[PDB]
Design a protein around this nucleic acid. Structure first.
Lengths: 99, 99
DNA sequence: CCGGC
DNA sequence: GGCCG
């Protein structure tokens, strides 16, 4: 799990543009050369899109250092009953400045 | 640059269990040592879900050999003449039998 | 009947 | 993800 200690940008439901800008501004911070993008479930799609937009359109000197996926089961209390079985996946994309 | 030549499992819009099954069956083949799961756009999180189900629940010894993301330009066509580029992300997850 | 709504 | 054009 590279990018240890690197700042983190968690992807949510806001327009992908916001996260693209978040990644760019973070990598602009003095002494910061890495950023890890994290997302869970459906947001994983947006996380990948943001990274590709960053690399293909804003900064070609940003490399995809590493990518890791994982998951976990959460408790989803049924409507009126009691039971839960839901596994939520996650992705962590480690980005690094100027390869 | 790995998993070259390995059989593939294309994630579509069908339920995730269908692809979990496809991965397990592809793996059951005597010769297949690796399997590459591929997905584009909104199917990427489904690809990660399918792989996580497999790894956490059905083949706990399978290893994620490598993961790569990319994107391709799509020239769509507006209901109104004269369209333009659009970006679609993709992912490739190489799975490898324990050993 | 393929792609948009 | 089935109805619309």
């Amino acid at each position: 799990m590279a990018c240890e200690g690197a700042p983190e940008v968690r992807i949510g439901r806001k327009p992908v543009m916001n996260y693209v800008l978040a990644i760019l501004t973070t990598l602009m911070e003095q002494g910061t050369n890495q950023v890890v993008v994290k997302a869970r479930g459906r947001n994983i799609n947006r996380a990948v899109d943001a990274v590709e937009i960053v690399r293909k359109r804003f900064a070609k000197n940003i490399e995809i250092k590493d990518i890791k996926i994982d998951s976990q089961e959460i408790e989803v209390q049924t409507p009126e009953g009691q039971t839960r079985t839901r596994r939520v996946s996650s992705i962590e994309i480690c980005l690094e400045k100027a390869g």
